[PDB]
Design a protein around this motif. Sequence first.
Motif, PDB file in Angstrom:
ATOM      1  N   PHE A 101     -26.420 -24.497  21.815  1.00  0.00           N
ATOM      2  CA  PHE A 101     -25.449 -25.559  21.905  1.00  0.00           C
ATOM      3  C   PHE A 101     -26.017 -27.002  22.023  1.00  0.00           C
ATOM      4  O   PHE A 101     -25.269 -27.984  22.216  1.00  0.00           O
TER       5      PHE A 101
ATOM      6  N   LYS B  72     -14.591 -26.887  13.367  1.00  0.00           N
ATOM      7  CA  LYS B  72     -15.839 -27.459  13.780  1.00  0.00           C
ATOM      8  C   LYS B  72     -16.731 -26.466  14.441  1.00  0.00           C
ATOM      9  O   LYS B  72     -17.970 -26.495  14.241  1.00  0.00           O
ATOM     10  N   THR B  73     -16.131 -25.615  15.302  1.00  0.00           N
ATOM     11  CA  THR B  73     -16.906 -24.537  15.843  1.00  0.00           C
ATOM     12  C   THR B  73     -17.626 -23.714  14.798  1.00  0.00           C
ATOM     13  O   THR B  73     -18.819 -23.461  14.976  1.00  0.00           O
TER      14      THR B  73
ATOM     15  N   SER C 107     -10.760 -28.232  15.853  1.00  0.00           N
ATOM     16  CA  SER C 107     -11.966 -27.988  16.592  1.00  0.00           C
ATOM     17  C   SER C 107     -12.463 -26.500  16.426  1.00  0.00           C
ATOM     18  O   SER C 107     -13.672 -26.198  16.549  1.00  0.00           O
TER      19      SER C 107
ATOM     20  N   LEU D 114     -16.646 -31.250  21.375  1.00  0.00           N
ATOM     21  CA  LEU D 114     -16.557 -29.855  20.947  1.00  0.00           C
ATOM     22  C   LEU D 114     -16.802 -28.836  22.075  1.00  0.00           C
ATOM     23  O   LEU D 114     -16.097 -27.813  22.135  1.00  0.00           O
ATOM     24  N   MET D 115     -17.780 -29.099  22.956  1.00  0.00           N
ATOM     25  CA  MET D 115     -18.026 -28.157  24.052  1.00  0.00           C
ATOM     26  C   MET D 115     -16.838 -28.143  25.010  1.00  0.00           C
ATOM     27  O   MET D 115     -16.532 -27.133  25.595  1.00  0.00           O
TER      28      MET D 115
ATOM     29  N   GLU E 167     -27.175 -29.306  20.159  1.00  0.00           N
ATOM     30  CA  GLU E 167     -26.702 -30.365  19.263  1.00  0.00           C
ATOM     31  C   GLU E 167     -25.206 -30.327  18.940  1.00  0.00           C
ATOM     32  O   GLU E 167     -24.746 -31.042  18.030  1.00  0.00           O
ATOM     33  N   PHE E 168     -24.448 -29.504  19.685  1.00  0.00           N
ATOM     34  CA  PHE E 168     -22.973 -29.567  19.588  1.00  0.00           C
ATOM     35  C   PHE E 168     -22.483 -30.903  20.126  1.00  0.00           C
ATOM     36  O   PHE E 168     -22.942 -31.365  21.173  1.00  0.00           O
TER      37      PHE E 168
ATOM     38  N   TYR F  67     -20.575 -25.820  13.329  1.00  0.00           N
ATOM     39  CA  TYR F  67     -21.723 -26.105  14.150  1.00  0.00           C
ATOM     40  C   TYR F  67     -22.504 -24.852  14.605  1.00  0.00           C
ATOM     41  O   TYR F  67     -23.747 -24.912  14.836  1.00  0.00           O
ATOM     42  N   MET F  68     -21.801 -23.738  14.734  1.00  0.00           N
ATOM     43  CA  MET F  68     -22.482 -22.429  14.968  1.00  0.00           C
ATOM     44  C   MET F  68     -23.400 -22.063  13.813  1.00  0.00           C
ATOM     45  O   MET F  68     -24.564 -21.632  14.059  1.00  0.00           O
TER      46      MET F  68
END
Lengths: 287, 287, 287, 287
Positions: free
Chosen positions: B144, B235-236, B232, B151-152, B146-147, B239-240
């Motif tokens: 995580f 986006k998850t 979002s 988003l987190m 660079e999330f 970014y995963m």
Amino acid sequence: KTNERPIIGVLAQDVFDPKPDRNSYIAASYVKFLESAGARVVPVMINKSEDEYSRLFKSINGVLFPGGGVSLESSGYSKAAGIFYRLALEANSNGDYFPVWGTALGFELLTLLTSGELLLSHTNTSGIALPLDFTEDVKGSRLFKEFPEELMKSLATEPLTENSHQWSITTENFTANKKLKKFYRVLSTNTDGYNKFVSTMEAYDFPIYATQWHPEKNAFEWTRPYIPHTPSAIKTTFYMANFFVNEARKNLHSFASTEEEEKALIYNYKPEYTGIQSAFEQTYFFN
Amino acid sequence: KTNERPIIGVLAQDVFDPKPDRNSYIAASYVKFLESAGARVVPVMINKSEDEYSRLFKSINGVLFPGGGVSLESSGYSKAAGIFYRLALEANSNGDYFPVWGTALGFELLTLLTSGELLLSHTNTSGIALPLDFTEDVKGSRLFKEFPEELMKSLATEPLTENSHQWSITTENFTANKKLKKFYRVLSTNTDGYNKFVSTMEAYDFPIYATQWHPEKNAFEWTRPYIPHTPSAIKTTFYMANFFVNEARKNLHSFASTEEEEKALIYNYKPEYTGIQSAFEQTYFFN
Amino acid sequence: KTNERPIIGVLAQDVFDPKPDRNSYIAASYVKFLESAGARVVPVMINKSEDEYSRLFKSINGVLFPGGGVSLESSGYSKAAGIFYRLALEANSNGDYFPVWGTALGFELLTLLTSGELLLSHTNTSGIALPLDFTEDVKGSRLFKEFPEELMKSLATEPLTENSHQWSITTENFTANKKLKKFYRVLSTNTDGYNKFVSTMEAYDFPIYATQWHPEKNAFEWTRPYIPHTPSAIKTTFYMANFFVNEARKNLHSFASTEEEEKALIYNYKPEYTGIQSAFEQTYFFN
Amino acid sequence: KTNERPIIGVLAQDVFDPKPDRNSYIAASYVKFLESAGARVVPVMINKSEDEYSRLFKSINGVLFPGGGVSLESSGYSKAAGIFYRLALEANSNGDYFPVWGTALGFELLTLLTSGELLLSHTNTSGIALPLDFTEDVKGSRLFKEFPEELMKSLATEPLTENSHQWSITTENFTANKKLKKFYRVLSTNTDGYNKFVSTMEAYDFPIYATQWHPEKNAFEWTRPYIPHTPSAIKTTFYMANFFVNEARKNLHSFASTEEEEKALIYNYKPEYTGIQSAFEQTYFFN
């Protein structure tokens, strides 16, 4: 209210040497471009009826005019796009939000659709990766609002954008055209060393967005060695698609029935592998 | 140095009622997940020899163990996963960075490959969207790091992660296992109302990452009402995949020839539309 | 002649870590399911002698075997279920109509009591709502004969049926077993996307009815977000119970005295609120 | 928008010879009547502040005034009913839909709440099962709109409604009272041989419903030999509750916190077995 099941049309275009089951095509990178941002894709067939087009327009939630090498004035592609552009200004003027995206050839078609003139010059932009020379107008723009700070900086300083066009509109010829300069806000420009041209624009009054370059190629096409493939080039393809699909979530059209919907989706078509020899890894051909 | 042309293998897995050209399968969503983050994909066949896998292994830059309903013990899938798992621990301890991703069943498999035991118990999680309950260990995490911050916060509070599994490894049974506790950093947990179980983890000493949930569905699958599709959620999934493809970019394997490369690629196969009835929009079927 | 004061037994089931006054349990929702269709309920205790069961059987008008997580072969629950099954086959064979209901574990136990084998497979079916895929035989069926047409339509097309089972019998295993194929008419099936499985059945020659799903949860259990609670799901539970209590009204057993009847009824027991914790809002514990 | 988790309050009534933890009570048959139609239940205590009742009114979706034998003018029940009545007219008149059900005693209280007068006459109705004599106005009606046609016919012609009341409003006295005739549509009447009286009514302008008879007894009370228990009596009780709970699904109230919801529900209380001595099989008693 928002549409969290967006469906987006991608315009098919005339094949140069046409054969049965190969009358028109879509590069698979444009589909993947939209799917990655959370949309499904309907392919928009090229020589249909005004009535079929309006029925599909009413069902889908936005549309994309892709790059390529077909005639801007006489192609099935150019007629279909004209229909979609008209229905889109009508819908949007009425208060029904309908986004339209133009890439490369689609960018060039948009300048003609709106000006009614064909104002492209030759540029040395055939095979190259370039940054974006943003205009002062970027800062309040729609397209780039939700782009991370760091990505905007990379965009301005790293070769992140794929250019493969021999024609552009110069900034000169853009400003000097009253309808263009009234209709579009320039977001970035670029130069081949003799010509400064428009690279990204968005309509002032409509959700119409267009790029001279090819945001879909960074993540998805591997077919030419200059194609940008850095981490920030990949983020660029995502953030660009993310914006457009978020625009298509403002559109509340749906298909008449789930069965009509299921039958329209790109899932009904299987691409060919074309990346040994052509600019596209995979391409869907259609009858 | 870096590999900006990464190629990731995705493991095929046994079809319950097989036939020629239908002995195994890969859900297209796995393929789309990785391509969207700037990787190309090689489908990894099921009952191949050790030598054949070790050749494939030596050519590719990462491997993904996807979800499914096959046996964690006696399937061709399980057999291939163990070989790749062994190959990757070898290469990483010798100093050759090679990343491994397991999703759902791939996550269950990893608990087994590393513990030597089956530690799974039943959870009421066959079709539910859940947030992630982050552990304190999320702070220094690699997955995580660079999330985006927003988003987190989204992951912690919004149901963005698709769960469709009948089994999990509770936090109790993970912790009580000396081998699993020393090997894996737990990054998130969840509850099914009754049992608290591990939902994301990564190896302390090895680039091996695993989610019990399905990051790929959010963008790519539209076959069940509960699949998260908010911006979002989209986006998850990006970014995963972006993190894992970043990992494979640290691996410098390549294929012996472009010809060998070209024939390995997923481009060579065509999916089938399975989205009207199954949990998958499209599935690749293999002989 | 009907019996307009039917009394149905519900089997209690072994408590995992048994303690005095907490050796077995019945979830309250099975009690409410039957009372709503105008029966009274008697709990059938777990570790009793054959004689006590024979006298209870002779006094009651139907029996239900509930879901749960107890052993199908060695539990006090299975011992007692086996006794009721034999008594019911005898009574019915002799011309004394006696209905048996099995729900979930109760449905699973019936495949074992009739085939003499355990034929269960794992299915990804632990906490999802499904519609029923009716077979051609629903048309003649006993169970569904009095359901409103619109309800039967909603059952085919909406997720009205609560699944919370680790195990099923696949329709291939069902059909391959000569005893089950001969004994039970399958009324509906379902799939977890890997294996198709039997979801509802009724004995050809006996009033034995069994559902792999839980019709009692829709009206009475509120502990998990996926349980069906639409008005059609509420109707389902009523009409399911309605059919079964109507079967019990064909039985004319009665208690040897009102004072014996009075001591046996579920009214002699108080449930505990278990809903914060467990999947059951309320549960009756027994010594 | 609809509320698929309705919670409905049921008002407790003054115990005649009160003692600690026995100051008030609810017959469990009213709790069962509503849970069977897909609702959860909150008992509404008798001796509380307007502030407490307003808080609870704002959390729940509907309220029911059950029968009994407490005073209509000075009991804790009458006073708390008055308050709920006033809160309801206010919320409905503001545009927030909130249904009210009165049965037998609660019916009679609604006539007083609306008229300001006690207008009850003696009837020979203390223990008899009757059909409903529908008025022409049943055809427009809200209450009966979704009853099956066969059930409506049965209600007209079979003794399906339980009457355990010594006092009624005669149709002569109803019509003669200006405020009642203005406020309630009479849906059915009945006669005891000597006087025609109102048995079912609904407010013209508010979601307020009342039966002089006891719908909850048919499925749930087994203490008296006149209680109807035919399959169509059983359906009568479900349909009646099913209408009311569907009214409560139009209300969007909710408790503030999940913890306060859990603490208010009927699940927190255990009823006594009262069936051997009293008219009620089970009765909840409260401090």
